[PDB]
Ligand binder design. Structure first.
Ligand SMILES: *[C@@H]1O[C@H](CO)[C@@H](O[C@@H]2O[C@H](CO)[C@@H](O[C@@H]3O[C@H](CO[C@H]4O[C@H](CO)[C@@H](O)[C@H](O)[C@@H]4O[C@@H]4O[C@H](CO)[C@@H](O[C@@H]5O[C@H](CO)[C@H](O)[C@H](O)[C@H]5O)[C@H](O)[C@H]4NC(C)=O)[C@@H](O)[C@H](O[C@H]4O[C@H](CO)[C@@H](O)[C@H](O)[C@@H]4O[C@@H]4O[C@H](CO)[C@@H](O)[C@H](O)[C@H]4NC(C)=O)[C@@H]3O)[C@H](O)[C@H]2NC(C)=O)[C@H](O)[C@H]1NC(C)=O
Ligand SMILES: *[C@@H]1O[C@H](CO)[C@@H](O[C@@H]2O[C@H](CO)[C@@H](O[C@@H]3O[C@H](CO[C@H]4O[C@H](CO)[C@@H](O)[C@H](O)[C@@H]4O[C@@H]4O[C@H](CO)[C@@H](O[C@@H]5O[C@H](CO)[C@H](O)[C@H](O)[C@H]5O)[C@H](O)[C@H]4NC(C)=O)[C@@H](O)[C@H](O[C@H]4O[C@H](CO)[C@@H](O)[C@H](O)[C@@H]4O[C@@H]4O[C@H](CO)[C@@H](O)[C@H](O)[C@H]4NC(C)=O)[C@@H]3O)[C@H](O)[C@H]2NC(C)=O)[C@H](O)[C@H]1NC(C)=O
Lengths: 208, 208
């Protein structure tokens, strides 16, 4: 009917990488052509802030607009658990819509990072699987990459985080390599970024 | 507004286990108190069938009913890729709603099942991780369990299937065991059920 609001968190990497810019994004869909004006109020821990920026209005081909406000967050503010509230007013609403988002609550726990070599049974294939088990972490926001000889290794896939029986998360990352590249003693590494790691970073190596 | 329809597939286990009964479920929500009658037509490969059964009507506390029709499917029919169509008629609809479901399309590929022992680095803990990598499978419907000494081992978690770079799926299953149970040479097994396995079943063992 009238507008709907969806509020999105930053990317885990952006909150953990010094390079990138974490932002909270408040998306308003089904804004009418009759009432395209939307007012945003933003609050951080209940304190109203005034540095949000509205993205270019996006007109959809179902006769609605999509209007989006972005609030840049301090890395430390997000990781410290601050509460971000977006309030949306529009003439087609009988009352403003409010959404609130934050990092998951609970004591952070440091990932344990374990590298597992290919199974002997897999050595009948041309390509073999290098496994990085990351477990015991909380909250679930995390990033995982691989390297080899100082260079990024990109032929990998990582599972979503899975809730474990002790209330931490685990996941696995699988890097696929030419078997010969493995047999030649090349050194591979699994890099993990998470808030409860020293400098938000660790790497563990794996080689034959 | 008026009713909505959601059509659900069988459980992978039910389609792969000789014991259990696979069914397709056509769920109609937001059925009004003014118009509670819903007519279902079911089609298998475009052929109308007449052996569906309607579940007991469920009245919700938002002044709507939930009405559900269940069609039992032959194991072989689902795995052979038959198309199941549910057609829903109701007075509040301007036209019937139709939904169609089937198994994912594409050539099946047999899972490769590899067991990986705990990392040496993990042996500083009281509990260690036994890993079952299942890869190269298609379609994604699969079930995984663990055993030890002929008995079911239940302290495990399995990742959802992840789409790999070659268009097959992989996943990992993690069984957590007392370290001493591992060091004592107990034999653990990862059991996998999938349509492209011989007898829809395989198991691989792991021990120190
Ligand atoms: C007219 O046409 C319109 C265009 O087609 C159409 O608009 C759509 O409306 C939909 C609803 O009507 C709306 O659906 C929601 O989608 C949510 C997910 O949205 C993302 O992912 C989509 C698919 O991948 C994308 O299309 C979206 O753009 C969005 O993508 C994300 O965007 C964010 C913000 O930009 C971005 O994050 C930012 O990224 C940047 C970098 O780019 C930085 O990193 C920033 O730091 C960062 O903030 C993401 O990266 C990007 N991600 C992706 C994957 O692309 C979805 O979550 C909603 O689901 C909830 O609500 C529905 C009910 O509608 C429930 O069915 C569902 O279960 C979910 O409900 C929640 O469940 C929770 C339970 O765990 C519960 O806790 C919650 O309370 C509960 N909430 C609710 C409300 O129930 C939802 O499906 C869709 O996004 C719109 N599409 C577009 C393109 O705008 C419109 O509907 C049409 N009008 C008609 C038909 O009348
Ligand atoms: C009045 O109050 C009502 C009750 O609260 C409320 O009813 C709800 O309405 C919702 C929509 O308005 C409806 O939402 C949909 O939910 C879908 C998932 O439903 C399941 O999982 C839920 C949460 O876990 C459960 O609540 C549901 O019961 C259902 O659970 C499953 O049930 C099936 C069938 O029984 C069962 O399978 C069977 O199990 C048995 C054993 O028990 C056997 O094994 C059988 O063999 C087997 O068949 C499952 O096990 C069971 N699973 C679980 C997990 O419990 C959800 O999938 C829908 O999402 C789609 O649509 C929404 C739009 O509404 C999108 O936002 C979303 O992105 C999805 O869209 C799809 O996206 C695809 C992209 O990949 C795309 O390909 C599709 O085209 C696209 N489709 C559409 C339509 O867009 C959806 O969220 C909810 O289920 C209702 N809840 C209940 C309890 O009925 C009602 O709304 C209220 N009225 C109001 C507010 O006015």
């Amino acid at each position: 009917g009238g507008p709907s609001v969806f509020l999105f968190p930053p990317k885990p990497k952006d909150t953990l990488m010094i390079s990138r810019t974490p932002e909270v994004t408040c998306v308003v869909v089904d804004v009418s052509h009759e009432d395209p004006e939307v007012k945003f109020n933003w609050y951080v821990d209940g304190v109203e802030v005034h540095n949000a920026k509205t993205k270019p209005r996006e007109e959809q081909y179902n006769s609605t607009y999509r209007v989006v406000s972005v609030l840049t967050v301090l890395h430390q503010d997000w990781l410290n658990g601050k509460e971000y509230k977006c309030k949306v007013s529009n003439k087609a609403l009988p009352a403003p819509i409010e959404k609130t988002i934050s990092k998951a609550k609970g004591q952070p726990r440091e990932p344990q990072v374990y590298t597992l070599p290919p199974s002997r049974e897999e050595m009948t294939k041309n390509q073999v699987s290098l496994t990085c088990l990351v477990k015991g972490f909380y909250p679930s926001d995390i990033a995982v990459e691989w390297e080899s000889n100082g260079q990024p290794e990109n032929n990998y896939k990582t599972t979503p985080p899975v809730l474990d029986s002790d209330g931490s998360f685990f996941l696995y990352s699988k890097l696929t390599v030419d078997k010969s590249r493995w047999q030649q003693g090349n050194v591979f590494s699994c890099s993990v970024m998470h808030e409860a790691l020293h400098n938000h970073y660790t790497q563990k190596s794996l080689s034959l």
